[PDB]
Amino acid sequence: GDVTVILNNLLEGYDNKLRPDIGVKPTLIHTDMYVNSIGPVNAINMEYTIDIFFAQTWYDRRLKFNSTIKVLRLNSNMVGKIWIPDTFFRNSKKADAHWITTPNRMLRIWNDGRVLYTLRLTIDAECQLQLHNFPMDEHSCPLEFSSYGYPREEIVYQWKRSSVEVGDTRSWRLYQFSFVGLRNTTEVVKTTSGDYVVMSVYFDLSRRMGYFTIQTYIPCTLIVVLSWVSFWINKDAVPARTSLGITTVLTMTTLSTIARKSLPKVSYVTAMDLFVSVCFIFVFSALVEYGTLHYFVSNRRIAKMDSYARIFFPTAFCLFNLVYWVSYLYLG
């Protein structure tokens, strides 16, 4: 067949070890990306999973051919025969191409030498999460790629018209986050082996709030309110108010165990930690309030401490909530 003749001629005398225009000009590569799905964001490992169809286009004058056929639509067979850019992902903790049922790769060569190379990738990309506002935290997780060995004088990457395309975002594996939008940038990073053109895609993510409201914020609030029931109980009910005071503390301690459930052991105070800790202080103080009241009135103004607590405790907790939610939902 004439196609066999064309393919044999293109590979005759062809050295895949040499970049196109090796001593003439940088090899300009045009990159596309189709995000199949953004997998789960792993806060503990500071990484997220992404699945893409990665496309790269460049010109290779050694692959020009003259025939009525205007494009050679090939499978992954010829990928290892021609020169392929050494594009790697800089923040990739772990990545792998797909091999079922065959190498998930595409190679198309036009008669003017333009080469389209596509392959499917699954990448575990590093994303350093600033969890200070958790669970009201927003992140922009990057995906950087560049040439491993070719500096900017030899390989230059460039986005196409539609840089990054996304399909049905509702089908993604974002359990804890909602996709907001994406941005793509281009920069030059200087390393010890030269300066490299680095292409980045940033995926904006906002954490969903529904689970934490039902699971933590409301139960912690109800325990705090239940601790105020003591202030309306007679001070002579020593077993009743002490049991109420210490059981809310035990409940609040139980509720505190899920505050850092799926997070790395960071040492700063998150928004969830601040709320739970303050709620613990409130139930702690309600029990200490009765102990002071019981001692001075009986176990020896303080004699009216119940009247003050019926106002101060709801007011201080309402004021805390007012400052807490304003400064975490509107003041960032």
Partner: protein, 340 residues
């Protein structure tokens, strides 16, 4: 033009014996190494290792690969590394390592006109370091990476850090959620095995564990529950239901805190500083409950029959109102001075 580069490269690789090191039979080949650390993660107390991702570069001159007429540093496809001699460098404490391979094998070969070879690899390695966690969570760990040559001895190959102390970069940019990298340093020495003496390069980090996590999760809950157990000392002795409920629930709460931490914290099966503090707090809440049982028994058991007085019920409570806060403060002072 590109034919001349093709002819030059073909000339270099023709007759090239990959079995022979550069300057074979002569002076040992000097290999310079730089490491750019992309990240450190998975610092495991349980497995006694950490995971390191890095750009590992090796530098040496191979006069067989010197070329003339091309004022360029020829970057070649990384598959040419298989046709060239590269050092047999290995990491002694490496447990599981791989070279990243997306979209191609993350490898670099760059030739230079004088024959110098720049050989770069992107390696994620799980390196073993023994950890002394007896002071956990106030421990400081020193984890190393032992770079050595496997086959060639010091007669055939020599290692050095290319750039001196600047050989390893990216350490200052590393963000570890649980540690701060206090210091890193580089050591070049020789190691003798039963099979000979080999060059060694050592890269060591000093990790100091961040304590702010444990202040909120361990010490503050324990301190606050311990203080709550002292509230019973200010409760009337007749309130048996109140003081017993307060005492035994604080014990239960201390058990809840201790058993929760046994799950979330790494399972380190010997006694650490975290265990001594939790056990110390559990003894205080245990003793505070025993204090009332003593108080109740003195009033009722020894009442009709008729260091504190041990016969006055009020004196025992007033004694405990001072000693329990004082001893727990003394316990913390001894604890924190001994560990901080």
């Amino acid at each position: 033009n590109m034919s001349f580069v093709k002819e030059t490269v073909d000339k270099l690789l023709k007759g090239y014996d990959i079995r022979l090191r550069p300057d074979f039979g002569g002076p040992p080949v000097c290999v310079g190494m730089n490491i750019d650390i992309a990240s450190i993660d998975m610092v495991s107390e349980v497995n006694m290792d950490y995971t390191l991702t890095m750009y590992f570069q090796q530098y040496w001159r191979d006069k067989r690969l010197a070329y003339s007429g091309i004022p360029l540093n020829l970057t070649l496809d990384n598959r040419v590394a298989d046709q060239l001699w590269v050092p047999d460098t290995y990491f002694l404490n490496d447990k599981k390592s791989f070279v990243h391979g997306v979209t191609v094998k993350n490898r670099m070969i760059r030739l230079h006109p004088d024959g110098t070879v720049l050989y770069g690899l992107r390696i994620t390695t799980t390196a073993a370091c023994m950890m002394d966690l007896r002071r956990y969570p106030l421990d400081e760990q020193n984890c190393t990476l032992e770079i050595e040559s496997y086959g060639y001895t010091t007669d055939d190959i020599e290692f050095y850090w290319r750039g001196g102390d600047k050989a390893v970069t990216g350490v200052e940019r590393i963000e570890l959620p649980q540690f701060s990298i206090v210091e890193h340093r580089l050591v070049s020495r020789n190691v003798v095995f039963a099979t000979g003496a080999y060059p060694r390069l050592s890269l060591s980090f000093r990790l100091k564990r961040n304590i702010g996590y444990f202040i909120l999760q361990t010490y503050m809950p324990s301190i606050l529950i311990t203080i709550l157990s002292w509230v019973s000392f200010w409760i009337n002795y007749d309130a048996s239901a109140a003081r017993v409920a307060l005492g035994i629930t604080t014990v239960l709460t201390m058990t809840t805190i201790n058993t929760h931490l046994r799950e979330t914290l790494p399972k380190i099966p010997y006694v650490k500083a975290i265990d001594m503090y939790l056990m110390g707090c559990f003894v205080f809440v245990f003793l505070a409950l025993l204090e009332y049982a003593f108080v109740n028994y003195i009033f009722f058991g020894r009442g009709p029959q008729r260091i504190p007085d041990l016969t006055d019920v009020n004196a025992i409570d007033r004694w405990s109102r001072i000693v329990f806060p004082f001893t727990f403060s003394l316990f913390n002072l001894v604890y924190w001075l001994y560990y901080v």
